[PDB]
């Protein structure tokens, strides 16, 4: 019953991925962002110079205020607003309506995106981590509880400008090829994963596998980076630096400040390593592994007819993001129901003349519980 959903995300490179959705009687529609890495479900809600149109409370009947007050900070961006309930649908989803609460948006500081073409943001993560506590019941807990949606969804993000799907309650298997692996969540609150492994061109980081879960390990559809902790970052940048050591690049180039440009068509894709990272199985002692390649890490951006990009690795002080960076090209089941996410190569994967990202296995890994913190 997928095709309905297949293709329902756009967006702008590292502006993230939107649905529509409508809230509100009549109906409002508002493009929506999708972020695995929050559990708040926030429209717009009043005139901001980066809106195209925003949630009128005033004009929907079954608006009802509850009478409390939000503010979410997330790791780069805040707003606050008044908390309420009305009713929404995904009209590229399900068929279905949910009376789901709802953040009014009343102010906001470094979120709203510059025509970025979405208005809100819907939080897939767990109430644990809801603002303002975790009895404001996140929207996909709604859905499953007032509806016969079975508990998982799937995000197919495609590169570049950029689209993708939300299956929402199942997994459209003409959006894969190979198989499916699975990691279990550790907990949940973000979708925490351990990672067990880190391999740069096939070459073991070697660190005590605790550095790459300090202190913890997420999947974010809302953040654009691969984020890793201090320790880890270091060790891969120097690692990443080697590799491409043939050509020269400013130090603010791998701090994500500067771009780095070549004539168009020229971009040297074989200097730069893949990266893998290993994530816990579901048997004992198993894991499997996601290779990431150039063409993902090095993120697109706007000028010339020079190709260029931005260093899309960075820095965490709150542990390892795997953000859209690494889910693109690959279907990504969330799996609630079973506790386990789950990484195939997408149909639309990212592949050069030589090599191409992939997931594999199964593999032997030992002490992998030694790996979380
Ligand atoms: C109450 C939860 C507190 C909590 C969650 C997280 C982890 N998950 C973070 C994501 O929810 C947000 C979501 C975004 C703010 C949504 C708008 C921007 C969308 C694309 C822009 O991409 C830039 C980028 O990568 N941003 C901004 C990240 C650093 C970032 O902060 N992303 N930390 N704290």
């Not at 019953?1 to 529509?20: A, I, T």
């Not at 979405?118 to 603002?131: H, M, S, T």
């Not at 303002?132 to 019941?137: A, F, G, M, T």
């Not at 690494?326 to 997408?346: L, P, Q, T, W």
């Amino acid at each position: 019953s997928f095709v309905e959903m297949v293709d329902n995300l756009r967006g702008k490179s590292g502006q993230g991925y939107y649905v529509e959705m409508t809230v509100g009687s009549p109906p409002q529609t508002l493009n929506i962002l999708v972020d695995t890495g929050s559990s708040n479900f926030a429209v717009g809600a009043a005139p901001h110079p980066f809106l195209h149109r925003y949630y009128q409370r005033q004009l929907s009947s079954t608006y009802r205020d509850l009478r409390k007050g939000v503010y979410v900070p997330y790791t780069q961006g805040k707003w606050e607003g008044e908390l309420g309930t009305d009713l929404v649908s995904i009209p590229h989803g399900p068929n279905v309506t949910v009376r789901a609460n709802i953040a009014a948006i009343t102010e906001s500081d470094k979120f709203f995106i510059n025509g970025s073409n979405w208005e809100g943001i819907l939080g897939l993560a767990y109430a644990e981590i809801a603002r303002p506590d975790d009895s404001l019941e996140p929207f996909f807990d709604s859905l499953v509880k007032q509806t016969h949606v079975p508990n998982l969804f799937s995000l197919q993000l495609c590169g570049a400008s950029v689209g993708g799907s939300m299956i929402i309650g199942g997994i459209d298997h003409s959006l894969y090829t190979g198989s499916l692996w699975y990691t279990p969540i550790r907990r949940e609150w973000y979708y925490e994963v351990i990672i067990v492994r880190v391999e740069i061109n096939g070459q073991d980081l070697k660190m005590d596998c605790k550095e790459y879960n300090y202190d913890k390990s997420i999947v974010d559809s809302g953040t654009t980076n691969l984020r890793l902790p201090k320790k880890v970052f270091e060790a891969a940048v120097k690692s990443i630096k080697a590799a491409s050591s043939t050509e020269k690049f400013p130090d603010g180039f791998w701090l994500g400040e500067q771009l780095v440009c070549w004539q168009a068509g020229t971009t040297p894709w074989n200097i730069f390593p893949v990266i893998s990272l290993y994530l816990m199985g579901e048997v004992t002692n198993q894991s499997f592994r996601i290779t990431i390649l150039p063409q993902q890490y090095l993120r697109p951006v706007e000028d010339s007819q020079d190709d260029c990009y931005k260093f899309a690795i960075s820095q965490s002080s709150t542990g390892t993001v795997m953000g859209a960076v690494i889910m693109e090209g690959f279907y990504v089941v969330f799996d609630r129901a079973r506790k386990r996410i789950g990484f195939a190569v997408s149909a639309c994967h990212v592949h050069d003349e030589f090599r191409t990202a992939a997931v594999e296995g199964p593999f032997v890994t030992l002490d992998m519980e030694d790996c979380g913190y």
